[PDB]
Write a protein that binds this DNA or RNA. Structure first.
Ligand SMILES: Nc1ncnc2c1ncn2[C@@H]1C[C@H](O)[C@@H](COP(=O)(O)OP(=O)(O)[C@H](F)P(=O)(O)O)O1
Ligand SMILES: [Cl-]
Ligand SMILES: [Cl-]
Ligand SMILES: [Cl-]
Ligand SMILES: [Mg+2]
Ligand code: NA
Ligand code: NA
Ligand code: NA
Length: 326
DNA sequence: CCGACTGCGCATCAGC
DNA sequence: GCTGATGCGC
DNA sequence: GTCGG
């Protein structure tokens, strides 16, 4: 892709600031720059050219200037050789280890993959399962495997109740030829903004998926969000599929369109769209879009009958899921 | 210059 | 137990 | 780190 060198660098800078510096605005700034440059349809040739895009200011401009001259960036290379930074960054790759636990583990001298296995008694549950499948969760999921995962989920969801609708979101819905995990939006018509006419609604689905041995592990669960692990079944003599992260969100059925807009993303598109919502004086979440009053108070939920209606309110031309991969 | 930066579910911890 | 703040991940 | 007012 066209500016891979530059965006890779900004992403490594973003990760450093989040994981090591715990500077979450620099992280979000670097990611925004990495995003707007990733879609810029020319091969960048100077820092000043890039400064024209919003989100690239002066600091990033000079870094682009150095990178284009030398092919590298001294800030990054010094960071790659600071053993502490290098080790915090690595620990945050285990699901459930963020910048704080990663640094906490440094101070105790727990630093390699082996150190983690040696010390499983120091991990909470999520961190334990993340260590268990560390290598699997690094692998991406070919869309062909996603189609099989979708057929299992949707067919097993129907066998619990045929009134459930389950929609696969994430990069899958955006047309990606591969995905990092599997995001499932769930609706059932006895769970609306007005009433929870049935308990266990998400449990029943998770239970069925464990009974057929599709869902293999649980990172976290509550009445509307499930995050865990699943595995496709394999054939005789055939190697096993990698284990895969799976998330299931139960959203009130009358709030489907805000939920599917949320869960389709991308995360940076969502962040860009909600930012623009605020410029137009609205606030969007995964349930509602509401006006902000003269006092900044969120008002009452506007009516939404399509994904497009949400775009209409904030005066954006509608964007198809495939064009939301920011 | 400088306030503001998207929004939220679940796990965990502190303090009561 | 609850509440509110924080970590973490989406 | 960036930027709109
Ligand atoms: N910080 C955030 N703010 C707002 N929305 C956010 C968000 N983080 C994740 N979301 C998202 C949108 C995403 O598509 C959806 C699922 O989030 P996810 O982490 O699975 O990202 P995807 O978009 O599916 C990736 F492309 P991949 O899974 O293929 O690697 O919820
Ligand atoms: Cl910051
Ligand atoms: Cl809706
Ligand atoms: Cl709401
Ligand atoms: Mg995903
Ligand atoms: Na700019
Ligand atoms: Na992690
Ligand atoms: Na996910």
């Amino acid at each position: 892709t066209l500016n891979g060198g530059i965006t890779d660098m900004l992403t490594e800078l973003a990760n450093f600031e989040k994981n090591v510096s715990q500077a979450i605005h620099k992280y979000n700034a670097y990611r925004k720059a990495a995003s707007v440059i990733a879609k810029y349809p020319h091969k960048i040739k100077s820092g000043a050219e890039a400064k024209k895009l919003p989100g690239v200011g002066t600091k990033i401009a000079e870094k682009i200037d150095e990178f284009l001259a030398t092919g590298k960036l001294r800030k990054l290379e010094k960071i790659r050789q600071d053993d502490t930074s290098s080790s915090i960054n690595f620990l945050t790759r285990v699901s459930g280890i963020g910048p704080s636990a990663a640094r906490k583990f440094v101070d105790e001298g727990i630093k390699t993959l082996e150190d983690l296995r040696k010390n499983e008694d120091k991990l909470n549950h999520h961190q334990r399962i993340g260590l268990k499948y560390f290598g699997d969760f690094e692998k991406r999921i070919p869309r062909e495997e996603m189609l099989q995962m979708q057929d299992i989920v949707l067919n097993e969801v129907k066998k619990v109740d045929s009134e459930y609708i389950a929609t696969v979101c994430g990069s899958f819905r955006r047309g990606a030829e591969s995905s990092g995990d599997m995001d499932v939006l769930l609706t059932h018509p006895s769970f609306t903004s007005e009433s929870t006419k049935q308990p266990k609604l998400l449990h029943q689905v998770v239970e069925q998926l464990q009974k057929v041995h599709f869902i293999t592990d649980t990172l976290s669960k509550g009445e509307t969000k499930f995050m865990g692990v699943c595995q496709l079944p394999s054939k005789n003599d055939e190697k096993e599929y990698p284990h895969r992260r799976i998330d299931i969100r139960l959203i009130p059925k009358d709030q489907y369109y805000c939920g599917v807009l949320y869960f389709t993303g991308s995360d940076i598109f969502n962040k860009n769209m909600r930012a623009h919502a605020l410029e137009k004086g609205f606030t969007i979440n995964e349930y509602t879009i509401r006006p902000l009053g003269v006092t900044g108070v969120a008002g009452e939920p506007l009516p939404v009958d399509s994904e497009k209606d949400i775009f209409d309110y904030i005066q954006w031309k509608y964007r198809e899921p495939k064009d939301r991969s920011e």
